[PDB]
Amino acid sequence: IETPEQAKTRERSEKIKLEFETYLRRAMKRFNKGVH
Amino acid sequence: LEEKNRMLQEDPVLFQLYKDLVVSQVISAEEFWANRLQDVGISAAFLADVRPQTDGCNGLRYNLTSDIIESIFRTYPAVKMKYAENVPHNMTEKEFWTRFFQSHYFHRDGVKNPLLDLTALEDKPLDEGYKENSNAAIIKRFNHHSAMVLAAGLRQPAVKRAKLQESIEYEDLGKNNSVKTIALNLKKSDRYYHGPTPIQSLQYATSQDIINSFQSIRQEMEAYTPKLTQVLSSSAASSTITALSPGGALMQGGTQQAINQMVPNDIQSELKHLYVAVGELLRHFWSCFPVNTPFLEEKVVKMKSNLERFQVTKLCPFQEKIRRQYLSTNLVSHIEEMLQTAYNKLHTWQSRRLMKKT
């Protein structure tokens, strides 16, 4: 209801950070499972 | 007391007048204030017009105003319930407004029988043998809001017969009396021909000698020739100039005196204050007059006592202040005239009352 473009940019930043951190999480799980 | 003090502060001259009338014991505060002593309709545009002010520097200026909230409460009593059930404990007011903006509540995008009972308009109600949801919701809530606004605007066979009579009657084939006037015809119209002009000694001329004079002048001017030298003379011209000369009889009076410098501006302002005070006192006196009830007698007696007290406590010091400067202006004379006129009026009315009783 206030500066919708700022809210959309925040949502995009959250989305890209979430994708980055989730793929990092998957890579870390692959790494430790391979170590085991 | 606090409200009265604030109101007096809003008018310092009255506050000064109130002080000069009460502290000087001229009048009591009860008698002082004895004579001394906005709703907005519901508009349907209070929602669409009112928007969250989105100032460019990411400013969400709500501009929360009491009238807007009152209009919302009147139109939507549910909002009043939500406000009363949440603040100040469950949630803050601004957070509630923000939730209202984000909620779907904001971003939503018969007494008369004959012509209202649509269910009863048909005498054959047999059985059924002989984004639509969004649109329906929008229509329903719009109708609800309109009904709420209409209701907030306010804040039997006889009825049916009256409605039918109103509906059927034709203004053309009725009555058109419209004669709500009273004619006037005075008795003697000659009163206005010679009106408030007093009687004048409009003397009539003599007997037929008047006709003789008329014939004489008629013959005299019947053979007339224009003249030029006889029109005026220097001696007559000199007399006319002298009459028109400065200081002449036609030039009545002459130069005058600067009254402004003769009286100090402080004395002038105090004279204005005394004028207003005496004027209001005498206005109340004349409002009481004429005394048609026994209660008015005591009120006018108190008025005279207040006038006497005010005169003694202010004008006499004011008279002394003027007299020390030896001002030649008789400003006090006007006040004395008014006071004596009122006192004589009251004394004469008392004399009349005594005469009527005896």
Q: Which residues of A touch B54 (CB under 8 A)?
A: 1-3
State whether A1 and B60 contact (CB < 8 Å). yes
H/E segment holding residue A23: helix A4-35
- The DSSP symbol for A17 reads H
In this structure, are residues B62 and B94 in contact, taking their beta carbons and an 8 Å threshold? yes
In this structure, are residues B98 and B64 in contact, taking their beta carbons and an 8 Å threshold? no
Q: How far apart are CA B339 and CA B299, in angstroms?
A: 17
User: Quick check: A3 contacting B, CB < 8 Å?
Assistant: yes
Question: Which residue's entry shows tokens 């006018």?
Answer: B300
SS3 sequence of chain B: CHHHHHHHHHCHHHHHHHHHHHCCCCCCHHHHHHHHCCCCCCCCCCCCCCCCEEECCCEEECCCCHHHHHHHHHHCHHHHHHHHHHCCCCCCHHHHHHHHHHCCCCCCCCCCCCCCCHHHCCCCCCCCCCCHHHHHHHHHHHHHHHHHHHHHHHCCHHHHHHHHHHHHCCCCCCCCCCCCCCCCCCCCCHHHHCCCCCCCCCCCCCCCHHHHHHHHHHHHHHCCCCCCHHHCCHHHHHHHHHHHCCCCCCCCCCCCCCHHHHCCHHHHHHHHHHHHHHHHHHHHHHHHCCCCCHHHHHHHHHHHHHHHHHHHHHHHHHHHHHHHHCCCCCHHHHHHHHHHHHHHHHHHHHHHHHHHHC
- Extract the tokens encoding A35: 């170590």
- Vertex B37: Cα angle to B36 and B41 (nearest 5): 135
Q: Which residues of A touch B98 (CB under 8 A)?
A: 1
Chain B interface, best mutation among A1, A3, A5, by max B CB count within 10 A: A1
Q: How far apart are CA B308 and CA B346, in angstroms?
A: 13
In this structure, are residues B42 and B149 in contact, taking their beta carbons and an 8 Å threshold? yes
How was this structure obtained?
cryo-EM
CA distances from B181 to B178, B186, B303 (A): 9, 16, 45
In this structure, are residues B36 and B3 in contact, taking their beta carbons and an 8 Å threshold? no
Q: How far apart are CA B21 and CA B8, in angstroms?
A: 13
In this structure, are residues B74 and B155 in contact, taking their beta carbons and an 8 Å threshold? yes
User: Quick check: A32 contacting B, CB < 8 Å?
Assistant: no
The one-letter code for the residue type at B193 is Y
- Extract the tokens encoding B24: 């000087």
Identify which of B173, B197, B327 has the alpha carbon closest to the alpha carbon of residue B265. Answer: B327
CA distances from B42 to A3, B64, B141, B152 (A): 31, 17, 18, 7
Half-sphere exposure (CA, 13 Å, Cβ side) for A19?
A: 5
Cβ atoms within 10 Å, residue B320:
9
Shortest distance between the Cα of B58 and any Cα of chain A, in A, equals 6
Shortest distance between the Cα of B88 and any Cα of chain A, in A, equals 23
Collapse the DSSP code of A2 into the 3-class scheme (helix H, G, I; strand E, B; otherwise coil) and give the result: coil
In this structure, are residues B249 and B243 in contact, taking their beta carbons and an 8 Å threshold? yes
Number of residues that make up chain B: 358
Query: From the centroid of its chain, how far is CA B92?
Result: 46
**What phi-psi label fits residue B70: left (phi over 0), alpha (psi between -120 and 50 degrees) or beta?**
alpha
Q: How far apart are CA B336 and CA B311, in angstroms?
A: 9
In this structure, are residues B160 and B113 in contact, taking their beta carbons and an 8 Å threshold? yes
